[PDB]
Chains A and B, each alone.
Chain A
Amino acid sequence: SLTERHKILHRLLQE
């Protein structure tokens, strides 16, 4: 997935 291929980026998107 596009989300699944961007761990950190996504991980960084929510905090």
Chain B
Amino acid sequence: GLTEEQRMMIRELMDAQMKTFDTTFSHFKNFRLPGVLSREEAAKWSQVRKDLCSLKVSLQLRGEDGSVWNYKPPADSGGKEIFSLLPHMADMSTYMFKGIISFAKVISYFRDLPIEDQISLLKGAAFELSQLRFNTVFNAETGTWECGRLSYCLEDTAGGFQQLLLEPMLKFHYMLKKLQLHEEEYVLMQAISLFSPDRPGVLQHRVVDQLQEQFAITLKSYIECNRPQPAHRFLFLKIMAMLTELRSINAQHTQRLLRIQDIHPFATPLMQELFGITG
């Protein structure tokens, strides 16, 4: 089994997960919705349309009484029509972010770090931790993020499957999902990501690194103590491979979001801090 330190490391992680991850999205309300409606910048738009392109989603709002509101976004054309779902997303992302921040807070190993670092880490891992939480509510069978009463569905497009997979973000959710991971391994993934000793601004590199290794090691043992099936050989390695891919998708997504924010500002105050949105 796991050492007694390990066994309790997973517990504080799980506890933190349970106290800050509103898996039913019951406290997510008062959010915005789509209404009931020149050479340099030109190239910029061309890129934005390519950035928001295969991230297009449908929004469904199943109500208490049994009513069902459904929003199908506009197909590509003109301009502003490709930003109609951005304000709502900004509210989801912000709601998700607040949760992440809480998560890091109750974690004892995080609190014992210099606030500067605690910020560097949150700054450099939010999106990542957010993707890991969303994955738990992703239904790969229907390409839809089931978030309590509201759900986000993927819009089929050019090339279809093999095409969507060209979108790192999309591929990341489908491959991660394929690994059918436990809550314990998801929360360990979050910790390992949170304590990345290589994020910009991080001061105590040697300590954080010591911490990431501690978690990485717990995950590795956990997998051995709970999945000896020769089939699960390399599972730990597949996950680390995933975290690395996620870190790469996160770097691009930031650049992706800036390009968008540049053309059509939308980020919330908090998002601005987290993404360093210039002003």
Interface residue ranges of B93-127 to A (CB < 8 Å): 98, 101-102, 105, 115-116, 118-120, 122-123
Which of chain A's residues 1-15 have a Cβ closer than 8 Å to chain B? 2-3, 5-10, 12-13
A12, B115: Cα distance in complex, Å: 12
The reply to whether B273 and A3 form a contact with Cβ atoms under 8 Å apart is: no
Residues of A within 8 A of B (CB): 2-3, 5-10, 12-13
B interface residue count range (under 10 / 10 to 19 / 20 to 34 / 35 or more): 10 to 19
Within 8 A of A (CB), among B184-211: 201
From the candidates B98, B102, B105, B119, name the one contacting A6 in the complex (CB within 8 A): B119
A2 touches B116 (CB 8 A): yes
In the A-B complex, the 9 residue pairs with the closest CB atoms? A6-B273, A9-B273, A12-B101, A8-B270, A2-B116, A6-B119, A2-B119, A8-B269, A2-B201
With CB as the reference atom, state the residue of chain A lying closest to B276: A5
**Chain A residues in 8 Å Cβ range of B270:** 8-9
Interface core residue of A5, A6, A7 (most chain B CB under 10 Å): A6
Residues of B within 8 A of A8 (CB): 269-270, 273
A12 → B minimal CB distance (Å): 5
Q: Which residues of A contact B101 (CB under 8 A)?
A: 9, 12-13
Contacts of A10 in B (CB 8 A): 115, 119
A13 vs B118: C-alpha distance in the bound complex, in angstroms? 9
Report the minimal beta-carbon distance from A8 to chain B, rounded to whole angstroms. 5
A11 to B116, CA, bound (A): 13
Residues in B whose Cβ lies below 8 Å from that of A7 = 273
Interface contact A9-B122, CB-CB below 8 Å: yes
Q: Does B16 contact A (CB under 8 A)?
A: no
